[model samples]
Target: HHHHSSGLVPRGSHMKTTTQELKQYMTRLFQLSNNETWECETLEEAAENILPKRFINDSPLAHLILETYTYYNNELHELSIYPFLMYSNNQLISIGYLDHFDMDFLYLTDTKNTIIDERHLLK
Candidate 1:
């Protein structure tokens, strides 16, 4: 049997989503596989089909990462990191976290750090 919990929040309540919910959503977003097909020839169409409009609007960098993933299909080009939503003090905030690959040379490099940090700050 499938069990679903509805303890999230009310429309005007000050309740916040748990860390578990944030993790679940972030994991689902970044766990996409290249084998999946949207029956589209271009990255733009594929992204639009695969990703939700809210996610696309909320995380623009993720859209670019998905495009890169589509083009290269290589592990290095995949979205090893992703931006996720979190509620802090009743305010919605976005944060970045490593999704795939471990800390490698590129992961430790300044350029990658700067890029990811800057992207996370975008509205």
Candidate 2:
């Protein structure tokens, strides 16, 4: 098994997510998106609809997504969103999960880090 730590705290620091908090965050994302309806399709379609920008932009919602991704990546040794891709005929269709919202079925072509750029947020 792999052990993950945020590296922002001491070795024994208690930095973990609670079920309630996850639910709350998910709800918040849904509300922030204004209950926009999403459809299932290719990774490119989802990216165009959800992220739009190929790179992470300086938006309040983007910040939230970055923070969520960072927290989960460090604490869980896993991504809150997972990326998948299909390959056929020397072509690739990368897909990522935006599990923070109720739209777990949705996927994007963006990589995890590309989805949430810390430098973009800092600027």
Candidate 3:
């Protein structure tokens, strides 16, 4: 009831970041949108990182992921957050996750789509 439009602390809908910007980014970046937005893979595996494959292989980022990530089986919610990077064509994809009360987001890009502009992603 009280959840109506009271003083929502300058909540003037920063939705552009979620929609207009996200849509334009996805459109110019990839083929289509995701089928199920939430359900996907987790890192902390051997060679199972980098969910999408665009290049001859997505192993560039995948290799980095395998190198940078370390799984602590004893820790609580270790591999919770997602990955992100303003990357090169070969290093363009990110995502975040959490149990609850905390959330993250990831970007999606490719390595073989002929990068709009090359970047020093791996550097």
Candidate 4:
């Protein structure tokens, strides 16, 4: 409406509809033009920007996760969110469930997945 009053173009005619459609198309065109790949100079540059950094030497959160991963014997399949949050605030930590293995332990083992045994919590 403001553009119409400024005499950029008339509003609400067939021309208006065509102009609006073209504007939407051009918006997408510009967005795609500036998208991620356009900024990366090469595959190595892209990977350095896009891939997660090495957790072992550089990231404290990675160390916690690696410790938990090794301690759990890689039995746990899910990633814990706690370490990430802690690491963001510069606090390094590991996650472990507290409790004892119960009769339900059999059910977990039946599927070849490690159940959180009671002993795991003690650590």
Candidate 5:
């Protein structure tokens, strides 16, 4: 059984525009991967997939360290850090957007993980 969770709101809730709704965004990110399949049984599973294992492993506090180092108003790259974490976990979750903001695109994989899904976030 796989489990996952995320803090961000759904693709079409409380936001004027979502990452899933952007056609150019999907096309750009999808070009980075080589797969065409996605996986995930539930929302929680999806969250687990997006976040990095370091963040989930609270006992050793490794995730905390990385977060701290990245934050101190340091020269950290927020977007780079997000994808790194999202790519580390194994049993991550993924979702595809059939039609986001009428873009006819999709966003697979969790926010914490990379575009590991085979579908590559394509419709």
Candidate 6:
């Protein structure tokens, strides 16, 4: 939340990956978290999904969000935002490299997560 002195600077697209390719990389990323024993599921996105009012594109923080993954319980679903495909030249490309781009993963939880009182179990 700090680091207020520094701001984001421009980087390169590195290569500029296409939409389909981006998703492919995403699925792989999801698989990776499980390798660490954390629950992350492969994601999906297309032309038909409805985005939240607070879009990855609408980045309330900067309207600068990316591929958003939401893990509800066990099934990690891609019911999120994506303006990443909107800019023909890839505006968010700055977030990626070697041609690929950026995205995000969010996990959903409930208060029964009163597991809250139990996070002290972490080593």
Q: Candidate 4 versus the native: TM-score?
A: 0.17
**lDDT (tens digit, per residue) of candidate 2 on 1-123:** 111355554343121222223334444543333133222233222222344453435433243222112122321223244222322222222222345452332222233332331222111
- Considering only N, C-alpha and C atoms within 3 Å, which residue pairs clash in candidate 4? 99-118, 100-118, 101-118
- lDDT per residue, candidate 1, 1-123, as tens digits? 111343354322221222334334444655645363222122323333443343344343333323211112343146654333322233322333434543211111111222223332221
Give the Cα-based TM-score of candidate 1 against the true structure.
Answer: 0.20
For candidate 6, write residues 3-98 as lDDT tens digits: 232337533332222333444454464452322222323233421242333332323323332343222322232423231332212222111112
Q: Count backbone overlaps in model 6.
A: 7
Instruction: Write the residue-wise lDDT of candidate 3 on 33-114 in tens digits.
Output: 3343322232343223434344326444555443122111212223343222232322334322233344333433344344
Each model's TM-score, in the order given? 0.20, 0.19, 0.22, 0.17, 0.22, 0.21
- Per candidate, the number of residue pairs that clash is 0, 1, 9, 3, 17, 7
Worst 10-residue lDDT window for candidate 5 reads: 67-76
Candidate 6, which ten residues in sequence have the lowest lDDT sum? 114-123
For 3-41, candidate 4 gives per-residue lDDT tens digits of 345556556633233333433343353332222111111
Ranking by lDDT: 3, 1, 2, 6, 5, 4
Deviation in angstroms for 91 in model 2? 1.8
Supply the TM-score for candidate 6: 0.21
Model 4 accuracy (lDDT, Cα): 0.24
Candidate 1 residue-wise lDDT at 4: 30
Candidate 2 lDDT score relative to the true structure: 0.30
Candidate 6 regions exceeding 4 Å error are 1-17, 32-83, 88-123
> Judged by lDDT, which candidate is best?
3
Candidate 5 positional error at 111, Å: 13
lDDT by candidate, in order shown:
0.32, 0.30, 0.32, 0.24, 0.28, 0.28
